[PDB]
Amino acid sequence: DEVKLLGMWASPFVLRVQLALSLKGVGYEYVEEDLKSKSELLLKSNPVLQKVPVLIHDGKPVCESSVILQYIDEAFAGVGPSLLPEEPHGRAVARFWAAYIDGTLVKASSQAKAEGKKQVTAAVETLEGALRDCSNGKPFFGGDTAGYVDVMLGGLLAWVHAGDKMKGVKTFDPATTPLLAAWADNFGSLDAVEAVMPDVGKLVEFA
Amino acid sequence: DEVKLLGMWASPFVLRVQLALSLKGVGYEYVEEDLKSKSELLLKSNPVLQKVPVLIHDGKPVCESSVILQYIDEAFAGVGPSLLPEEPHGRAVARFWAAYIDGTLVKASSQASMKAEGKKQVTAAVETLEGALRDCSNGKPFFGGDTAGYVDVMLGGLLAWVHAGDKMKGVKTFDPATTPLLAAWADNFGSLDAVEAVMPDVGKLVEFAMAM
Ligand SMILES: CC1=C[C@H]2O[C@@H]3[C@H](O)C[C@](C)([C@]24CO[C@@]1(O)[C@H]4O)[C@]3(O)CSC[C@H](NC(=O)CC[C@H](N)C(=O)O)C(=O)NCC(=O)O
Ligand SMILES: CC1=C[C@H]2O[C@@H]3[C@H](O)C[C@](C)([C@]24CO[C@@]1(O)[C@H]4O)[C@]3(O)CSC[C@H](NC(=O)CC[C@H](N)C(=O)O)C(=O)NCC(=O)O
Ligand SMILES: CC1=C[C@H]2O[C@@H]3[C@H](O)C[C@](C)([C@]24CO[C@@]1(O)[C@H]4O)[C@]3(O)CSC[C@H](N)C(=O)O
Ligand code: NA
Ligand code: NA
Ligand code: NA
Ligand code: NA
Ligand code: NA
Ligand code: NA
Ligand code: NA
Ligand code: NA
């Protein structure tokens, strides 16, 4: 398609890029990376970090899921809806919660063991507040349609579901964070999301 | 037209915001926060993280230095030069190197500052950033070209904190012998009037570092 994703099926960072491409309806070639013996194309395309996702558009590689999400938004502006808000302030809000998901939630969630689990439920509690304040009674961070923040968090949903099914816990417990519980179901049930969301059972085996 | 910056004189993250405002020529109110006893305005403006910088433009706060730089770029468009490249690819390169400075260089120099292992990672990251400069600059003085751009400000924000460390240690982080492009860059960016106007006294930074 002249759009190539260097991927790994179990990565939430790769799932972010798949979700962004799917929501717009941009076609792409998926290439599965073996991260134990990395491809020539991966090592040439991301020489500094050697991680997936990499998006290659028209010979030019793009690295880091949040950078890729923004790239997609700028380069495919005329194809399907935008993830980023139109106005500077709304964009600043979206990038803030993007930074928080990666800098706070993922630092804690990857670390989660007891002490890490204290930080995870604190970060989830904050994200319940983010959703109430961003959404304004609408289903998503982006409003009536899924936006940047929804994709950054939505990318981690299968990872979160697998973790939950292993432990016997709900990260998005309806008793504690009802808005996030409903959001996981609403985002999860989008046709564009269901088309790329990996089987949870398969994730569990991998981990 | 009200720009208030909730700052701390020793923060490289704050100095990023000052650099961007200075390079554009946007006026702002600098407010020095005490991070030991945080103000009511800081606690209300950044309720989730309680960190400086916060930029308040017409009553609306913005948090996280890299987010703030991009906001200024979007909100003050055609006041002075833009920090971000025009084309999506060049912006993706600029955002990549921004993420690398925060995620790799700063993570390593904090681990160095709290020793050999961290010194391996700092040297490694500076080496990589020599390559970023060669590839980004295209024979011009800066990452953003003939004028400073986003990457120059993200790295430029750490120059005071680098120079104090270097002053106390007797070492160059941007050593001419090992990263000559970065050494020339540090001198070029540091000699800009817009940079010089907000660059803290090294001697006061030395003392502050020495306390920690
Ligand atoms: C929350 C969470 C989920 C897990 O998902 C995958 C797996 O289940 C374990 C794993 C380590 C973690 C464990 O915790 C995780 O944070 C994560 O890291 C995982 O491999 C990560 S994905 C492969 C990885 N890529 C990135 O890190 C990209 C990050 C980049 N900032 C982006 O945004 O583009 C890579 O390529 N590593 C190099 C190599 O493996 O050789
Ligand atoms: C390289 C480096 C320099 C030092 O600079 C300042 C000081 O010299 C010591 C200090 C801790 C370090 C020590 O090593 C440093 O990494 C950093 O950590 C320092 O206080 C940091 S600035 C104040 C801090 N802000 C942020 O962290 C914002 C980051 C955010 N991602 C952004 O981008 O907005 C805050 O507001 N903290 C709240 C509280 O103090 O309660
Ligand atoms: C007296 C002060 C002046 C003022 O100058 C610059 C700017 O306008 C805001 C700033 C933070 C201050 C705020 O009050 C200050 O103390 C200083 O901290 C500043 O970036 C300092 S850089 C330059 C100078 N070498 C220094 O270190 O003083
Ligand atoms: Na952070
Ligand atoms: Na909010
Ligand atoms: Na909408
Ligand atoms: Na300039
Ligand atoms: Na606020
Ligand atoms: Na960035
Ligand atoms: Na990084
Ligand atoms: Na300039």
Side-chain angles (χ1 to χ4, degrees), chain A residues 1-106 108-112 114 116-207, chain B residues 1-114 116-212:
Chain A
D1 292 76
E2 100 210 322
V3 190
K4 186 183 290 180
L5 184 52
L6 316 184
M8 196 274 295
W9 70 274
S11 171
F13 307 110
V14 172
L15 182 62
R16 293 163 172 175
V17 181
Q18 300 187 288
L19 287 168
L21 295 165
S22 188
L23 290 158
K24 291 169 102 57
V26 171
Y28 62 107
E29 196 184 1
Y30 192 91
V31 175
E32 180 60 38
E33 288 287 338
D34 187 1
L35 298 174
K36 296 168 285 182
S37 62
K38 286 163 170 186
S39 80
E40 177 177 358
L41 185 56
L42 176 53
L43 301 165
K44 112 148 95 205
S45 304
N46 192 1
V48 162
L49 295 184
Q50 314 185 350
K51 298 174 185 184
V52 298
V54 186
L55 193 82
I56 315 181
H57 190 195
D58 303 309
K60 292 290 199 84
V62 184
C63 291
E64 291 285 308
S65 62
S66 66
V67 172
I68 293 165
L69 273 46
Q70 298 181 75
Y71 179 82
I72 291 170
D73 231 49
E74 289 161 14
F76 298 93
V79 189
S82 281
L83 291 188
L84 285 171
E86 189 174 342
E87 286 288 282
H89 187 263
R91 281 188 182 179
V93 168
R95 292 188 178 119
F96 180 85
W97 292 113
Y100 184 86
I101 292 161
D102 285 354
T104 301
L105 184 59
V106 169
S109 168
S110 180
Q111 177 170 340
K117 271 301 316 180
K118 200 171 70 168
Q119 294 199 316
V120 171
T121 105
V124 163
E125 292 282 59
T126 297
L127 285 168
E128 179 73 8
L131 181 58
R132 177 194 72 219
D133 297 350
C134 284
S135 77
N136 196 15
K138 297 163 120 161
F140 296 112
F141 290 95
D144 289 313
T145 59
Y148 184 53
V149 172
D150 302 283
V151 178
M152 290 285 289
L153 188 56
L156 302 156
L157 276 167
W159 169 262
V160 165
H161 286 32
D164 287 12
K165 289 181 194 80
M166 290 180 293
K167 278 38 174 145
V169 302
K170 292 176 195 174
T171 301
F172 305 138
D173 184 1
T176 279
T177 59
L179 302 180
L180 282 176
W183 170 85
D185 281 16
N186 282 312
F187 184 89
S189 285
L190 292 192
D191 286 344
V193 172
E194 290 185 65
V196 300
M197 183 69 68
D199 197 287
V200 66
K202 300 281 170 201
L203 271 303
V204 198
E205 298 193 337
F206 172 86
Chain B
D1 209 358
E2 72 96 62
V3 192
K4 195 197 296 215
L5 180 53
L6 306 201
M8 192 271 278
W9 71 278
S11 170
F13 305 113
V14 173
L15 180 48
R16 294 170 172 167
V17 186
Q18 297 189 253
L19 287 163
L21 298 166
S22 186
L23 284 164
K24 269 182 176 300
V26 171
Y28 61 111
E29 179 187 5
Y30 191 88
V31 174
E32 180 61 39
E33 294 297 338
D34 189 359
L35 304 179
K36 295 290 295 183
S37 61
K38 287 167 174 169
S39 75
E40 209 202 291
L41 180 57
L42 181 49
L43 298 165
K44 287 190 172 300
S45 306
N46 195 351
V48 19
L49 293 184
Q50 300 154 40
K51 291 185 194 168
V52 296
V54 184
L55 195 70
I56 318 193
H57 186 196
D58 313 319
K60 287 171 159 208
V62 187
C63 303
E64 294 282 309
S65 64
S66 62
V67 177
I68 293 164
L69 273 44
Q70 292 184 82
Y71 177 84
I72 297 163
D73 227 45
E74 294 171 355
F76 299 85
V79 172
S82 280
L83 292 192
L84 284 177
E86 297 310 323
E87 302 204 308
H89 190 260
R91 282 169 178 234
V93 175
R95 293 185 181 119
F96 178 83
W97 293 113
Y100 182 82
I101 292 160
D102 285 355
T104 298
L105 178 64
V106 164
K107 201 166 199 177
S109 187
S110 87
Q111 182 182 143
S113 307
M114 284 150 54
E117 159 51 3
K119 273 175 269 198
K120 321 267 87 184
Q121 293 177 311
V122 167
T123 287
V126 172
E127 168 164 77
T128 304
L129 288 158
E130 182 68 348
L133 182 59
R134 176 161 288 128
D135 295 353
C136 291
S137 70
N138 204 11
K140 297 165 180 301
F142 295 110
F143 287 92
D146 289 309
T147 61
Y150 187 55
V151 179
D152 301 277
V153 178
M154 294 280 291
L155 191 52
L158 301 168
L159 274 166
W161 183 253
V162 162
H163 179 24
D166 293 10
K167 206 95 190 172
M168 86 191 263
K169 288 162 175 153
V171 305
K172 286 177 191 160
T173 300
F174 310 129
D175 180 6
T178 61
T179 56
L181 306 177
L182 281 175
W185 172 81
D187 294 342
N188 284 323
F189 185 84
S191 73
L192 290 176
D193 288 342
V195 174
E196 284 182 349
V198 300
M199 256 309 147
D201 191 76
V202 66
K204 203 69 197 62
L205 250 186
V206 171
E207 305 202 5
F208 179 81
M210 291 173 72
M212 304 218 100

